[PDB]
């Protein structure tokens, strides 16, 4: 199940470090038991159910900060803060109740974040990336006016004051719900896994947005480079995560970034489709003896089954857009589309043996041409006209 740290048994840094480290080497999620202010914390959360309502006049900006109306009378209240005065992230939280929860979750979360880094991060220069003077936080509150959201946190760790209405993936596929109301829940983010350089891995979580969930995620300063081998920062990963969580907000504030992420899903789609089509066509060719190409409608159900989704004739035509010489697709005797492997060689097949690598290489090429051009980039691969 879930690793549990009892604070009445282990309370100081000397005791907690080997415990935290042993956990982090095999887990990304753990419970905090007997926290000295669990009662006060639970009282504050209870207060949020009837008072200190979300500021509906606040708006929701490009920093993914403010108040956002969701469906089913659910309200999101979120604040992203950074210690850097050069950054316009000045608000940690708003109302007295949320501020009290923040102060308790931060002091606790900052302590354990440093333990997490000390545990699985070898770089001495990264041992002090997070301090009381250098950090960034995201305080998230869901409010319900009387399904699960899947996300992958990107901080060092995310804390939940109550281990309730949250699902996770055991390290032993399938979601399992966590129901330990007397404990806080800790989950590590991708930054810790990344900086561990293989020592630690994390996993996505699931929450019920109608269960008044509160969470605090903690980072080093947002301007911190992810790695020496790149220019991407924590800000880039935070943005991508927030875009995936709130795509409609993204469509307004970050339309290009959204359309790229959507196009990448289309890329992933067409690559698997090609591999599936290769298998299906190869198998069908075995149940033949004469050079009569199969009608496309015959192949679709098998292709759809392997793709685990409905695949239409239009989808297969996307493959030709990426590589027109991939297949020979034409109308038959009775006006139905047929599909078969090419018989004759061209300059491509005379110089490249692998059909597998050929499609992948031309998929990325097509992908770059779209995102390098300044014309309105598409979110999908256009169907090749016959």
From Swiss-Prot:
One GO term in the molecular function aspect is: DNA replication origin binding
Record's subcellular location: Cytoplasm; Nucleus
Q: Which GO terms describe its cellular component?
A: cytoplasm; nuclear pre-replicative complex; nucleoplasm; nucleus
- Biological-process GO terms, alphabetical: cell division; double-strand break repair via break-induced replication; pre-replicative complex assembly involved in nuclear cell cycle DNA replication; regulation of DNA-templated DNA replication initiation
What is this protein's function?
A: DNA replication licensing factor, required for pre-replication complex assembly. Faithful duplication of the genetic material requires 'once per cell cycle' DNA replication initiation and elongation. Central to this control is the tightly regulated formation of prereplicative complexes (preRCs) at future origins of DNA replication. Required for the recruitment of the MCM2-7 helicase complex to the replication origins.
Subunit composition?
A: Associates with the MCM2-7 complex. Interacts with MCM2, ORC1, ORC2 and ORC6.
* Family membership noted in the UniProt record: Belongs to the Cdt1 family.
Protein's recorded name:
Cell division cycle protein CDT1
Q: Which organism is it from?
A: Saccharomyces cerevisiae (strain ATCC 204508 / S288c)
Tell which residues of the whole protein are contained here: 14 to 430 of 604
């Amino acid at each position: 199940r879930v690793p549990v740290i009892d604070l009445n048994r282990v309370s100081d840094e000397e005791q907690l470090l080997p415990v935290v480290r042993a956990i982090l080497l095999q887990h990304d999620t753990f419970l905090l038991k007997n926290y000295a202010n669990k009662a006060v914390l639970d009282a504050l959360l209870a207060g949020l159910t009837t008072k200190d309502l979300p500021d509906t006049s606040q708006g929701f900006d490009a920093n993914f900060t403010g108040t956002l109306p969701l469906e089913d009378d659910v309200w999101l209240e979120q604040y992203i803060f950074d210690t850097d005065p050069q950054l316009r992230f000045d608000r940690k939280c708003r109302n007295e109740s949320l501020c009290s929860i923040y102060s308790r979750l931060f002091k606790l979360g900052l302590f354990f974040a440093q333990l997490c880094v000390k545990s699985v991060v070898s770089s001495a220069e990264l041992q002090d990336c997070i301090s009381t003077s250098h950090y960034a936080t995201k305080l998230t509150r869901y409010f319900n006016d009387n399904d699960y959201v899947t996300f992958l946190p990107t901080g060092v760790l995310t804390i939940f004051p109550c281990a309730k209405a949250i699902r996770y993936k055991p390290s032993t596929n399938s979601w399992v719900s966590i129901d330990e109301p007397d404990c806080l829940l800790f989950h590590t983010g991708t930054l810790l896994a990344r900086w561990s350089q293989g020592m630690h891995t994390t996993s996505p979580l699931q929450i019920d947005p109608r269960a008044n969930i509160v969470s605090l995620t903690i980072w080093p300063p947002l301007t911190t480079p992810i790695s020496s081998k790149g220019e991407g920062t924590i800000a880039n990963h935070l943005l991508e995560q927030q875009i995936k969580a709130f795509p409609k907000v993204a469509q307004q504030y970050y339309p290009r970034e959204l359309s790229i992420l959507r196009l990448q899903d289309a890329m992933k789609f067409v690559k698997e489709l090609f591999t599936v089509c290769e298998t299906v066509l190869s198998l069908n060719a075995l149940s033949r003896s004469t050079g009569v190409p199969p009608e496309l409608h015959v192949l679709l159900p098998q292709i759809s089954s392997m793709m685990k989704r409905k695949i239409v004739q239009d989808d297969i035509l996307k493959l030709l857009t990426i590589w027109s010489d991939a297949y020979v697709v034409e109308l038959n005797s009775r006006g139905e589309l047929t599909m078969n492997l090419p018989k004759r060689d061209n300059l491509t097949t005379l110089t490249n043996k692998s059909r597998t690598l050929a499609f992948v290489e031309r998929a990325e090429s097509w992908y770059q041409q779209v995102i390098a051009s300044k014309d309105e980039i598409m979110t999908d691969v256009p169907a090749f006209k016959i």
